[PDB]
Design a protein around this nucleic acid. Sequence first.
RNA 1: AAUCCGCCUCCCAACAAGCUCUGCGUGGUGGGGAAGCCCGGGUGACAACCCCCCGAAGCCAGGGAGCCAAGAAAAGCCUCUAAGCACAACCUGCGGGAACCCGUACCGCAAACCGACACAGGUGGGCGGGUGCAAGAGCACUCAGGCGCGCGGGAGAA
RNA 2: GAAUGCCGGCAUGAGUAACGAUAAAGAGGGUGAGAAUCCCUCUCGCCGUAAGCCCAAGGGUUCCUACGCAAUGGUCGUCAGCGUAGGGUUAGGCGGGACCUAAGGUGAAGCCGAAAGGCGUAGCCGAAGGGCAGCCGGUUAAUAUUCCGGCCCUUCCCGCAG
RNA 3: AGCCGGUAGCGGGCGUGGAUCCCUGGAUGUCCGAAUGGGGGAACCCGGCCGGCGGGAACGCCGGUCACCGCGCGCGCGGGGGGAACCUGGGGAACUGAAACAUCUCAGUACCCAGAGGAGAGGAAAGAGAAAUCGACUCCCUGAGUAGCGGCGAGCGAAAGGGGACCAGCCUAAACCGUCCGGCUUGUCCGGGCGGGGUCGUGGGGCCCUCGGACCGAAUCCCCAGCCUAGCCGAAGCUGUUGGGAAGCAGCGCCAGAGAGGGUGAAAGCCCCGUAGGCGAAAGGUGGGGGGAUAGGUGAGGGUACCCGAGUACCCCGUGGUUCGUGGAGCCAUGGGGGAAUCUGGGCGGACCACCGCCUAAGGCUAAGUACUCCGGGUGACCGAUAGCGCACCAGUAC
Lengths: 107, 70, 95, 97
Amino acid sequence: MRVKMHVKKGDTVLVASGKYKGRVGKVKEVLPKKYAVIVEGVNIVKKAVRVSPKYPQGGFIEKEAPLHASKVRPICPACGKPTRVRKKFLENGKKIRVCAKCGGALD
Amino acid sequence: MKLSEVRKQLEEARKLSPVELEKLVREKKRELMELRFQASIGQLSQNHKIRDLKRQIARLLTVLNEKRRQ
Amino acid sequence: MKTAYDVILAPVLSEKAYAGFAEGKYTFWVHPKATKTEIKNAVETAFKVKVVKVNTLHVRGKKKRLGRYLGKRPDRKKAIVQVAPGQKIEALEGL
Amino acid sequence: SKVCEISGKRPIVANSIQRRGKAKREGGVGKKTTGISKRRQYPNLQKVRVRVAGQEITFRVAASHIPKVYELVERAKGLKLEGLSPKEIKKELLKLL
RNA sequence: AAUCCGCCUCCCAACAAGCUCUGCGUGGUGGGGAAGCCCGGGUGACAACCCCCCGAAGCCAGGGAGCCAAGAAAAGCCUCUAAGCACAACCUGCGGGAACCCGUACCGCAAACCGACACAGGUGGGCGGGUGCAAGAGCACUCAGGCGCGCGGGAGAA
RNA sequence: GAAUGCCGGCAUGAGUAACGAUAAAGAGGGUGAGAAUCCCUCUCGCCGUAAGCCCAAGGGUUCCUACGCAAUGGUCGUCAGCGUAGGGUUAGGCGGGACCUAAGGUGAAGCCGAAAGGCGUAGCCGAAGGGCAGCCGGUUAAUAUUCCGGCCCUUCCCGCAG
RNA sequence: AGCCGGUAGCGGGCGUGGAUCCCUGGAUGUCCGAAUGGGGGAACCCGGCCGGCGGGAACGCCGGUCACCGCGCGCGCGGGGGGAACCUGGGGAACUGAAACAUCUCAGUACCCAGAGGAGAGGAAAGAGAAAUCGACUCCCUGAGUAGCGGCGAGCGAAAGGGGACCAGCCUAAACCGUCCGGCUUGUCCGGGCGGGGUCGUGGGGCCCUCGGACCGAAUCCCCAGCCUAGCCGAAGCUGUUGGGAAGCAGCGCCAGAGAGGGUGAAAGCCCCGUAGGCGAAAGGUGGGGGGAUAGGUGAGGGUACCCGAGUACCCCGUGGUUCGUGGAGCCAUGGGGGAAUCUGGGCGGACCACCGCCUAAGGCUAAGUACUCCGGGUGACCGAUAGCGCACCAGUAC
Ligand SMILES: [Mg+2]
Ligand SMILES: [Mg+2]
Ligand SMILES: [Mg+2]
Ligand SMILES: [Mg+2]
Ligand SMILES: [Mg+2]
Ligand SMILES: [Mg+2]
Ligand SMILES: [Mg+2]
Ligand SMILES: [Mg+2]
Ligand SMILES: [Mg+2]
Ligand SMILES: [Mg+2]
Ligand SMILES: [Mg+2]
Ligand SMILES: [Mg+2]
Ligand SMILES: [Mg+2]
Ligand SMILES: [Mg+2]
Ligand SMILES: [Mg+2]
Ligand SMILES: [Mg+2]
Ligand SMILES: [Mg+2]
Ligand SMILES: [Mg+2]
Ligand SMILES: [Mg+2]
Ligand SMILES: [Mg+2]
Ligand SMILES: [Mg+2]
Ligand SMILES: [Mg+2]
Ligand SMILES: [Mg+2]
Ligand SMILES: [Mg+2]
Ligand SMILES: [Mg+2]
Ligand SMILES: [Mg+2]
Ligand SMILES: [Mg+2]
Ligand SMILES: [Mg+2]
Ligand SMILES: [Mg+2]
Ligand SMILES: [Mg+2]
Ligand SMILES: [Mg+2]
Ligand SMILES: [Mg+2]
Ligand SMILES: [Mg+2]
Ligand SMILES: [Mg+2]
Ligand SMILES: [Mg+2]
Ligand SMILES: [Mg+2]
Ligand SMILES: [Mg+2]
Ligand SMILES: [Mg+2]
Ligand SMILES: [Mg+2]
Ligand SMILES: [Mg+2]
Ligand SMILES: [Mg+2]
Ligand SMILES: [Mg+2]
Ligand SMILES: [Mg+2]
Ligand SMILES: [Mg+2]
Ligand SMILES: [Mg+2]
Ligand SMILES: [Mg+2]
Ligand SMILES: [Mg+2]
Ligand SMILES: [Mg+2]
Ligand SMILES: [Mg+2]
Ligand SMILES: [Mg+2]
Ligand SMILES: [Mg+2]
Ligand SMILES: [Mg+2]
Ligand SMILES: [Mg+2]
Ligand SMILES: [Mg+2]
Ligand SMILES: [Mg+2]
Ligand SMILES: [Mg+2]
Ligand SMILES: [Mg+2]
Ligand SMILES: [Mg+2]
Ligand SMILES: [Mg+2]
Ligand SMILES: [Mg+2]
Ligand SMILES: [Mg+2]
Ligand SMILES: [Mg+2]
Ligand SMILES: [Mg+2]
Ligand SMILES: [Mg+2]
Ligand SMILES: [Mg+2]
Ligand SMILES: [Mg+2]
Ligand SMILES: [Mg+2]
Ligand SMILES: [Mg+2]
Ligand SMILES: [Mg+2]
Ligand SMILES: [Mg+2]
Ligand SMILES: [Mg+2]
Ligand SMILES: [Mg+2]
Ligand SMILES: [Mg+2]
Ligand SMILES: [Mg+2]
Ligand SMILES: [Mg+2]
Ligand SMILES: [Mg+2]
Ligand SMILES: [Mg+2]
Ligand SMILES: [Mg+2]
Ligand SMILES: [Mg+2]
Ligand SMILES: [Mg+2]
Ligand SMILES: [Mg+2]
Ligand SMILES: [Mg+2]
Ligand SMILES: [Mg+2]
Ligand SMILES: [Mg+2]
Ligand SMILES: [Mg+2]
Ligand SMILES: [Mg+2]
Ligand SMILES: [Mg+2]
Ligand SMILES: [Mg+2]
Ligand SMILES: [Mg+2]
Ligand SMILES: [Mg+2]
Ligand SMILES: [Mg+2]
Ligand SMILES: [Mg+2]
Ligand SMILES: [Mg+2]
Ligand SMILES: [Mg+2]
Ligand SMILES: [Mg+2]
Ligand SMILES: [Mg+2]
Ligand SMILES: [Mg+2]
Ligand SMILES: [Mg+2]
Ligand SMILES: [Mg+2]
Ligand SMILES: [Mg+2]
Ligand SMILES: [Mg+2]
Ligand SMILES: [Mg+2]
Ligand SMILES: [Mg+2]
Ligand SMILES: [Mg+2]
Ligand SMILES: [Mg+2]
Ligand SMILES: [Mg+2]
Ligand SMILES: [Mg+2]
Ligand SMILES: [Mg+2]
Ligand SMILES: [Mg+2]
Ligand SMILES: [Mg+2]
Ligand SMILES: [Mg+2]
Ligand SMILES: [Mg+2]
Ligand SMILES: [Mg+2]
Ligand SMILES: [Mg+2]
Ligand SMILES: [Mg+2]
Ligand SMILES: [Mg+2]
Ligand SMILES: [Mg+2]
Ligand SMILES: [Mg+2]
Ligand SMILES: [Mg+2]
Ligand SMILES: [Mg+2]
Ligand SMILES: [Mg+2]
Ligand SMILES: [Mg+2]
Ligand SMILES: [Mg+2]
Ligand SMILES: [Mg+2]
Ligand SMILES: [Mg+2]
Ligand SMILES: [Mg+2]
Ligand SMILES: [Mg+2]
Ligand SMILES: [Mg+2]
Ligand SMILES: [Mg+2]
Ligand SMILES: [Mg+2]
Ligand SMILES: [Mg+2]
Ligand SMILES: [Mg+2]
Ligand SMILES: [Mg+2]
Ligand SMILES: [Mg+2]
Ligand SMILES: [Mg+2]
Ligand SMILES: [Mg+2]
Ligand SMILES: [Mg+2]
Ligand SMILES: [Mg+2]
Ligand SMILES: [Mg+2]
Ligand SMILES: [Mg+2]
Ligand SMILES: [Mg+2]
Ligand SMILES: [Mg+2]
Ligand SMILES: [Mg+2]
Ligand SMILES: [Mg+2]
Ligand SMILES: [Mg+2]
Ligand SMILES: [Mg+2]
Ligand SMILES: [Mg+2]
Ligand SMILES: [Mg+2]
Ligand SMILES: [Mg+2]
Ligand SMILES: [Mg+2]
Ligand SMILES: [Mg+2]
Ligand SMILES: [Mg+2]
Ligand SMILES: [Mg+2]
Ligand SMILES: [Mg+2]
Ligand SMILES: [Mg+2]
Ligand SMILES: [Mg+2]
Ligand SMILES: [Mg+2]
Ligand SMILES: [Mg+2]
Ligand SMILES: [Mg+2]
Ligand SMILES: [Mg+2]
Ligand SMILES: [Mg+2]
Ligand SMILES: [Mg+2]
Ligand SMILES: [Mg+2]
Ligand SMILES: [Mg+2]
Ligand SMILES: [Mg+2]
Ligand SMILES: [Mg+2]
Ligand SMILES: [Mg+2]
Ligand SMILES: [Mg+2]
Ligand SMILES: [Mg+2]
Ligand SMILES: [Mg+2]
Ligand SMILES: [Mg+2]
Ligand SMILES: [Mg+2]
Ligand SMILES: [Mg+2]
Ligand SMILES: [Mg+2]
Ligand SMILES: [Mg+2]
Ligand SMILES: [Mg+2]
Ligand SMILES: [Mg+2]
Ligand SMILES: [Mg+2]
Ligand SMILES: [Mg+2]
Ligand SMILES: [Mg+2]
Ligand SMILES: [Mg+2]
Ligand SMILES: [Mg+2]
Ligand SMILES: [Mg+2]
Ligand SMILES: [Mg+2]
Ligand SMILES: [Mg+2]
Ligand SMILES: [Mg+2]
Ligand SMILES: [Mg+2]
Ligand SMILES: [Mg+2]
Ligand SMILES: [Mg+2]
Ligand SMILES: [Mg+2]
Ligand SMILES: [Mg+2]
Ligand SMILES: [Mg+2]
Ligand SMILES: [Mg+2]
Ligand SMILES: [Mg+2]
Ligand SMILES: [Mg+2]
Ligand SMILES: [Mg+2]
Ligand SMILES: [Mg+2]
Ligand SMILES: [Mg+2]
Ligand SMILES: [Zn+2]
């Protein structure tokens, strides 16, 4: 019915694997189809661009590359630690993500 | 058209009589043709508007249908 | 519901259609199944004019391809309406 | 050569069996079948015209059920049939079967 | 049913006419209009637009004669009357209004159709000019128009 | 490892036969990275009861123009019926339908047949036959008895008059 | 919490005031197609009537309606066509086999046609067949390659019984009573509807005497549990090191009703999707289970001899079916001819007769157990692009 994204634009996440393991950043964009997320300042690559109206002088730009969604773990705004997400039911009774190490909400 | 604007159209429309709904559609179908003409001469940068009217006309006609069904 | 705005679709934009404005002959793309008599009433209620003469012709879509995929454009029908002496459909005078 | 309107008798398929030789019961060596082929046995259909309620009704019926036609005419007496078409009458009679 | 048609009798007319329909001619009016010259067009040009002859297989036509093998139908059309209706209705003249759907490009004896091919094959109807040769749709040359056939350059054996 | 096996790939013959009517070519100028082959001029040849023109089949955008040359073109290609794009087919009178019938087809009535189905007067359908009112010129890169110009005509509705 | 399909781009919008998306219901649904106003070379053409639109009478458009056939007192309901196999019925080959061929085989198969459905068929003994017996039907195992059939060749091939699966039995016709209608040969008349009545093989029923006067219960309907059509919750890991990348190796842990499996930059129980275990429907579909109504169902002697399904049984002729090929050839079925009876009636137990037994023909319905796989899911000592479906790819396409 829909791809399961445990992370969303734009909570704070740790990149736990790959070249950029350790880095922390906000999730700029989420791509459910590719099952990947763009993390700010992470996965930087050099793309070559034709000299154009858009890019006079030309040369290369820098682009944030998508990361496989599994490589990313949200940082809890309460305890400040990388975590798994849990689902919790309120009295509304809406459901919200809450951190797994402590109990804090994650929006 | 915005979600809230859609709720509002349906509310106001459901208050009209069939005769008014017919008349209102005839106007929007006209306003649509105008959009089509500006589309062809390359003077319609807000092209989403063409879709909107078409679906407004649909919604209106859908409601007109509701009325006639009793 | 059926209105005149359902019968008149778009104006024909071309050197040949423009050349008719001078003698009051306006060329529109109409719905392919639409009748001369029906087109008369339609142009009139849309552009508040008086139609005197209607000419129609069918325009078969051009066969066109995109690589592996051969296809065809939609068949069209255009009409050239004649407005009563001295009248003007201003939307088209445009140009 | 068709179907009986009363009895529903239809043409059936039977074999025509050609034989040679002397029967065992007559001291013969036995009977030999020298040929079998399919054939059809038709009901003995015949025409039966009867005047019923001033109209002429005709039946295509096997000879076996010819008197069943007249029985139906007798039982038609308790009916209001006059005014109807002959096509209509026949339907009434056959309904009484 | 019938005043129509058919049949019988009579009167007038008859290779006359009349009446009617078509062809051709004229016809108010509108059109076109060459060679050559100059860059499809401009000019020629106020273009001229006339006389004679040949003359169809085409038209008048549903004409005529002969022959035997004896040569569609139905509607439009005219006439008759029946139900009906005769304030209707139809005819004639005139006026205003109304007049829909599809095809229409291009090839069409062919490189665009049928032959797997831009294939020396096949494909129905009409037009098909001039001169000479007895005639002609024959033949030779030529008008208008269209072409030189989608590999070439050499050499000069068998 | 063989089945003149099956499917594919690549060889050989071989730079060989052939390049599709023996109507035929020659030069100059132009274009372009490239020209025997595209454009223009002059000269030469071929068709002319056609190898010209106009319809109908059939084909279905091949028509016109712009920009292109990988492949298609039996060579070449700047060219093309090829690639991309844009444009182009205008009718009361032309052809067909809202008219008629032909063979035949279908088929109320009716007849027949194991089933499916086969017949069948009427009627209906069925045309390149009957019927029916447009001729000359002008105009577009490309349509014209279709648009325009002139001069004519047909039916239907309604009204007036006789 | 993103979205405006594959599909990016140009150019523009939507979304926690809950979008995209997923399920359910509804609305719209040009033209053709059973195609059904009429025609037709399917997707086109042309009409009648009512209503509406245009200036609208001609013309055109919009809405509605108009085929034919069956059954029922013009009007109603139904029919028409389609579906991969499966199923019944109506017709029905040949190659081949017999090491030739005709009977026979292949085979009542292939195929054609009609029809039925989610199954169809069959089904409540005029049975079986020897048991002093069984007890509707269907389907499996077995009986059995038996009994037999057979140019006694090639070959063909049962049933009873036993073990199992499932389980269920019903409504009528007739006699007699009543009622409506019509017929003319006027009535204790004949006939046609409808209602009552009745449904059996220890024979049953009717009618006339006699005594006796609440239990069952649906295959129908109503409610409901359960299920299907979207989904949701779901334990436990950090660090070092090599490397582009850790899930590798190393150090120290942790979960487990979850160590199926697939991902993640390589080889991860603890990163992700999942897994064990749980939860979930407003709407539509189902509902064989649970509950409740309804229809329906129920005595005993004695007398009466009224009734118990007709061109039928029965006999003969021609054939089919059965293991049965004319054989001693019965049984079941029926094209032709003849042609009864109503329980003292009739069929059957393999010619026929006797005896002894069995059974109730000529009307109808009936779940489940059974067959199939277009569709959905699960699983493979199944394939892995010459394989596996003809197609992993825009294939019943190009050609
Ligand atoms: Mg790591
Ligand atoms: Mg680190
Ligand atoms: Mg919406
Ligand atoms: Mg609509
Ligand atoms: Mg122009
Ligand atoms: Mg209209
Ligand atoms: Mg008007
Ligand atoms: Mg047209
Ligand atoms: Mg036209
Ligand atoms: Mg399309
Ligand atoms: Mg015989
Ligand atoms: Mg014997
Ligand atoms: Mg003996
Ligand atoms: Mg024998
Ligand atoms: Mg006979
Ligand atoms: Mg007789
Ligand atoms: Mg008999
Ligand atoms: Mg008899
Ligand atoms: Mg008479
Ligand atoms: Mg007289
Ligand atoms: Mg007279
Ligand atoms: Mg004249
Ligand atoms: Mg003249
Ligand atoms: Mg004259
Ligand atoms: Mg002049
Ligand atoms: Mg001139
Ligand atoms: Mg000149
Ligand atoms: Mg001048
Ligand atoms: Mg001068
Ligand atoms: Mg002069
Ligand atoms: Mg001649
Ligand atoms: Mg003559
Ligand atoms: Mg005739
Ligand atoms: Mg006629
Ligand atoms: Mg009268
Ligand atoms: Mg019409
Ligand atoms: Mg044309
Ligand atoms: Mg032309
Ligand atoms: Mg031509
Ligand atoms: Mg030729
Ligand atoms: Mg010709
Ligand atoms: Mg030519
Ligand atoms: Mg050509
Ligand atoms: Mg050939
Ligand atoms: Mg060819
Ligand atoms: Mg061929
Ligand atoms: Mg070709
Ligand atoms: Mg050539
Ligand atoms: Mg040729
Ligand atoms: Mg010829
Ligand atoms: Mg000549
Ligand atoms: Mg001489
Ligand atoms: Mg001469
Ligand atoms: Mg000569
Ligand atoms: Mg000569
Ligand atoms: Mg000759
Ligand atoms: Mg010649
Ligand atoms: Mg010669
Ligand atoms: Mg020349
Ligand atoms: Mg040449
Ligand atoms: Mg050549
Ligand atoms: Mg050449
Ligand atoms: Mg070997
Ligand atoms: Mg070979
Ligand atoms: Mg070989
Ligand atoms: Mg060899
Ligand atoms: Mg091979
Ligand atoms: Mg080999
Ligand atoms: Mg090979
Ligand atoms: Mg050699
Ligand atoms: Mg050689
Ligand atoms: Mg050579
Ligand atoms: Mg050659
Ligand atoms: Mg040559
Ligand atoms: Mg020669
Ligand atoms: Mg040159
Ligand atoms: Mg040069
Ligand atoms: Mg060249
Ligand atoms: Mg070159
Ligand atoms: Mg000549
Ligand atoms: Mg054509
Ligand atoms: Mg072709
Ligand atoms: Mg093309
Ligand atoms: Mg053209
Ligand atoms: Mg072109
Ligand atoms: Mg060019
Ligand atoms: Mg090329
Ligand atoms: Mg080239
Ligand atoms: Mg090249
Ligand atoms: Mg080539
Ligand atoms: Mg080439
Ligand atoms: Mg070639
Ligand atoms: Mg060209
Ligand atoms: Mg082109
Ligand atoms: Mg252009
Ligand atoms: Mg005209
Ligand atoms: Mg009409
Ligand atoms: Mg017609
Ligand atoms: Mg006709
Ligand atoms: Mg027929
Ligand atoms: Mg009939
Ligand atoms: Mg006929
Ligand atoms: Mg007619
Ligand atoms: Mg006709
Ligand atoms: Mg005709
Ligand atoms: Mg004609
Ligand atoms: Mg005409
Ligand atoms: Mg006509
Ligand atoms: Mg004229
Ligand atoms: Mg032309
Ligand atoms: Mg004109
Ligand atoms: Mg008058
Ligand atoms: Mg898109
Ligand atoms: Mg953008
Ligand atoms: Mg965007
Ligand atoms: Mg909600
Ligand atoms: Mg839906
Ligand atoms: Mg429409
Ligand atoms: Mg139809
Ligand atoms: Mg209609
Ligand atoms: Mg029809
Ligand atoms: Mg009306
Ligand atoms: Mg009107
Ligand atoms: Mg209508
Ligand atoms: Mg059927
Ligand atoms: Mg059916
Ligand atoms: Mg059968
Ligand atoms: Mg049958
Ligand atoms: Mg046969
Ligand atoms: Mg055989
Ligand atoms: Mg075999
Ligand atoms: Mg065999
Ligand atoms: Mg054998
Ligand atoms: Mg044999
Ligand atoms: Mg043999
Ligand atoms: Mg033999
Ligand atoms: Mg057999
Ligand atoms: Mg069968
Ligand atoms: Mg069926
Ligand atoms: Mg069943
Ligand atoms: Mg089942
Ligand atoms: Mg029973
Ligand atoms: Mg045994
Ligand atoms: Mg033996
Ligand atoms: Mg057998
Ligand atoms: Mg058994
Ligand atoms: Mg048993
Ligand atoms: Mg079971
Ligand atoms: Mg039982
Ligand atoms: Mg009475
Ligand atoms: Mg009675
Ligand atoms: Mg009675
Ligand atoms: Mg009675
Ligand atoms: Mg008794
Ligand atoms: Mg029941
Ligand atoms: Mg979860
Ligand atoms: Mg987890
Ligand atoms: Mg490192
Ligand atoms: Mg690590
Ligand atoms: Mg470890
Ligand atoms: Mg497990
Ligand atoms: Mg695992
Ligand atoms: Mg795994
Ligand atoms: Mg491992
Ligand atoms: Mg492993
Ligand atoms: Mg794993
Ligand atoms: Mg579970
Ligand atoms: Mg679960
Ligand atoms: Mg008793
Ligand atoms: Mg008795
Ligand atoms: Mg009985
Ligand atoms: Mg009976
Ligand atoms: Mg017997
Ligand atoms: Mg017998
Ligand atoms: Mg037999
Ligand atoms: Mg037998
Ligand atoms: Mg024997
Ligand atoms: Mg026997
Ligand atoms: Mg018998
Ligand atoms: Mg019999
Ligand atoms: Mg007895
Ligand atoms: Mg007896
Ligand atoms: Mg018996
Ligand atoms: Mg016996
Ligand atoms: Mg027995
Ligand atoms: Mg006995
Ligand atoms: Mg028995
Ligand atoms: Mg049950
Ligand atoms: Mg069952
Ligand atoms: Mg199953
Ligand atoms: Mg499956
Ligand atoms: Mg494998
Ligand atoms: Mg594998
Ligand atoms: Mg492959
Ligand atoms: Mg394959
Ligand atoms: Mg491979
Ligand atoms: Mg597949
Ligand atoms: Mg393939
Ligand atoms: Zn926390």
